[PDB]
């Protein structure tokens, strides 16, 4: 607990840019693309007001559009007079991927017709298209193979406080060990993280801060309409914050919280608000109506685990279950606790052979061990109970491929 993330002071003009959404749609062969930027403002509305979205490729200015506020007619009452959408054309765009993180710079300027800048906001833009088609998860038209891992924001000395250095370190290690994706288990990550994954090249699963695995049944809260509000905000506020990052390719509704109506409601919300990304959720059996991807956790390669209500089918058998057609990517597999990862090769053998077995996310990146000191003042790795904490869950907080200090296992 406490204030574990940066505290800032931001000054905005009275007449300001209150929000902007960046979208990129392409033709079938990705030779052309249209960048669409919806901009919303606050303050005094005036005709002399203008918004100019310009796309930059390095020092070059690939495209630029300007227009006054006043959106298109959306219903019988008219439209948003406090909004405007710019659409820029882009020929032969440099596509973004974890392989080649090609980025552009989108600069949103709030100004007056006579050319006076009021304020400007910006973001990195990555031209990439994510879509599930014919049972396959496609990134720019090609079917992905997620070589991912789950990563908790953990520091052996700073607790759950992140810093650029620790982040960049992890990212390098990951890419160095042939990883291309990460799952923000199990909450939105520190803002800098997305920026790094954007530039370094990593597919990200942005996951809402919602886990109630302790309830009984697991969906006692998520199915209760009384809790729809609290959940709603943990999903919607994540989307409104990170929706512009190209590294974010999938939205997750949270973790271990059974499958309640609330999940379905929020699932549909994201789909309405942001069609650009698939939504997934493993709760309730990994293949519920609240997920676009069959995302089990720890489902074995050939062996079935016929648990009642929420069985874990052999990933290979799962894909062909009557009626099923979705792509399957484990949200968690290969529990790397201690001397583990045995049978890991079997998973990949299968991933490569089955078109719709598109990978998974190992569990997990780093050991959640904390540093304590003995009488002599020497440091040592501590876990469950080592702090008088009780009840505690022994050493189950150490499931990483690397030790708290990022030393490989």
Binding residues for its own copies, rule: CB under 8 A, are 134-136, 304, 314, 316-317, 319-323, 325, 353-356
Please report whether residue 329 would count as binding Na ion according to CB under 5 A: no
User: Which of these is catalytic: 38, 211, 256, 324?
Assistant: 256
Which one of 39, 139, 357, 366 is in contact with Na ion (CB under 5 A)? 357
- Residue 372 to residue 402: CA distance in whole angstroms: 19
Least Å distance, CB 298 to its own copies, is: 19
Least Å distance, CB 199 to Na ion, is: 28
Least Å distance, CB 327 to its own copies, is: 9
DSSP 397: T
Rounded alpha-carbon distances, angstroms, from residue 245 to 40, 268, 366: 18, 21, 24
Binding span for Na ion by CB under 5 A among 301-309, 317-325, 354-362, 375-383:
354-362
Query: Helices 228-242 and 261-273 sit at what angle, rounded to 10 degrees?
Result: 30
Return the number of the residue (71 or 285) whose C-beta is nearest its own copies.
Answer: 285
Q: Are 365 and 400 in contact (CB under 8 A)?
A: yes
Concerning whether 332 is annotated as a catalytic residue, the answer is yes
Near Na ion in 277-306, by CB under 5 A = none
| Residue environment code for 302-319, b if the CB has 16+ CB neighbours within 10 A, otherwise e | eeeeeeeebebbebbebb
Q: In what order do the strands lie in the sheet with 248-252?
A: 279-280, 248-252, 203-207, 181-183, 146-150, 357-362, 328-333
- Residue 314 to residue 295: CA distance in whole angstroms: 12
Return the number of the residue (136 or 161) whose C-beta is nearest its own copies.
Answer: 136
Return the number of the residue (56 or 354) whose C-beta is nearest Na ion.
Answer: 354
Dihedral sign from CA coordinates of 287, 292, 298, 304: positive
CB atoms within 10 A of CB 327: 26
Concerning whether 213 is annotated as a catalytic residue, the answer is no
- Residue 136 to residue 264: CA distance in whole angstroms: 22
Least Å distance, CB 356 to its own copies, is: 5
Per the listing, tokens 């007056």 go with 112
Binding span for Na ion by CB under 5 A among 62-70, 228-236, 265-273, 349-357:
349-357
Near Na ion in 361-400, by CB under 5 A = 396, 399
Return the number of the residue (261 or 337) whose C-beta is nearest Na ion.
Answer: 337
Which one of Na ion, its own copies, none interacts with residue 320, CB within 5 to 8 A by kind?
A: its own copies
Least Å distance, CB 25 to its own copies, is: 23
Least Å distance, CB 352 to its own copies, is: 11
Dihedral sign from CA coordinates of 167, 189, 383, 281: negative
Least Å distance, CB 359 to Na ion, is: 7
| Residue environment code for 39-48, b if the CB has 16+ CB neighbours within 10 A, otherwise e | bbbebeeeee
Size of the site for Na ion (CB under 5 A): 4
Q: Are 335 and 300 in contact (CB under 8 A)?
A: no
**348 — phi, psi (to 5°)?**
-70, -35
Return the number of the residue (65 or 384) whose C-beta is nearest Na ion.
Answer: 384
Per the listing, tokens 């009021």 go with 118
Near Na ion in 163-182, by CB under 5 A = none
CA-based nearest residue to 407, from 382, 381, 386: 381
Which one of its own copies, Na ion, none interacts with residue 399, CB within 5 to 8 A by kind?
A: Na ion
User: Which of these is catalytic: 153, 207, 282, 332?
Assistant: 332
Return the number of the residue (98 or 319) whose C-beta is nearest its own copies.
Answer: 319
Return the number of the residue (127 or 318) whose C-beta is nearest its own copies.
Answer: 318
Which one of Na ion, its own copies, none interacts with residue 319, CB within 5 to 8 A by kind?
A: its own copies
Q: Which residues are catalytic?
A: 256, 332
- Residues forming the site for Na ion (CB under 5 A): 354, 357, 396, 399
């Amino acid at each position: 607990s406490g204030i574990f993330r940066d505290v800032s002071l931001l000054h905005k003009p009275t007449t300001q840019i209150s929000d902007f959404h960046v979208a990129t749609r392409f033709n079938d062969d990705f030779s052309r693309a249209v960048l669409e930027a919806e901009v919303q403002m606050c303050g005094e509305l005036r005709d002399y007001l203008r918004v100019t979205v310009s796309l930059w490729q390095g020092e070059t200015q690939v495209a630029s559009g300007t227009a006054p506020f006043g959106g298109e007619i959306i219903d019988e009452r008219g439209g948003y007079a406090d909004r405007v959408t710019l659409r820029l054309n882009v020929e032969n765009p440099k596509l973004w991927s974890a392989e080649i993180p090609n980025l552009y710079r989108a600069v949103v300027e709030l100004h007056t017709a006579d050319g006076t800048l009021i304020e400007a906001e910006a973001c990195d833009v990555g031209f990439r298209e994510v879509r599930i088609e014919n049972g396959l998860l496609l990134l720019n038209g090609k079917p992905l193979l997620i070589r991912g891992v789950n990563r908790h924001e953990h520091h052996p000395l700073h607790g759950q406080v992140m810093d650029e250095q620790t982040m960049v370190q992890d990212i390098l290690l990951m890419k160095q060990n042939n990883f291309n994706a990460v799952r923000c288990s199990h909450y939105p990550n520190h803002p800098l993280w997305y920026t790094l994954c954007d530039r370094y090249g990593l597919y990200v699963v942005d996951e809402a801060n919602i886990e109630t695995e302790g309830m009984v049944p697991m969906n006692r809260l998520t199915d209760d309409p009384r809790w729809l509000p609290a959940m709603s905000e943990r999903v919607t506020r994540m989307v409104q914050r990170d929706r512009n990052h190209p590294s974010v390719i999938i939205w997750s509704l949270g973790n271990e919280s059974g499958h309640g109506a609330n999940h379905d409601a929020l699932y549909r919300w994201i789909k309405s608000v942001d069609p650009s990304r698939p939504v997934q959720y493993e709760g309730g059996g990994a293949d519920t109506t609240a997920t676009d991807i069959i995302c089990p956790m720890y489902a074995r390669v050939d062996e079935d685990q016929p648990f009642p209500a929420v069985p874990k089918w052999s990933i290979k058998k799962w894909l062909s279950l009557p009626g099923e057609t979705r792509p399957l990517i484990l949200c968690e597999y290969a529990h790397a606790m201690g001397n583990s990862l045995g049978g890991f090769a079997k998973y990949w053998q299968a991933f490569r052979q089955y078109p719709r077995l598109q990978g998974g996310f190992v569990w997990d990146w780093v050991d959640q061990s904390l540093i304590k000191y003995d009488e002599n003042g020497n440091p040592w790795s501590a876990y469950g109970g080592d702090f008088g904490d009780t009840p505690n869950d022994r050493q189950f907080c150490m499931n990483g491929l690397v030790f708290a200090d990022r030393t490989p296992h």
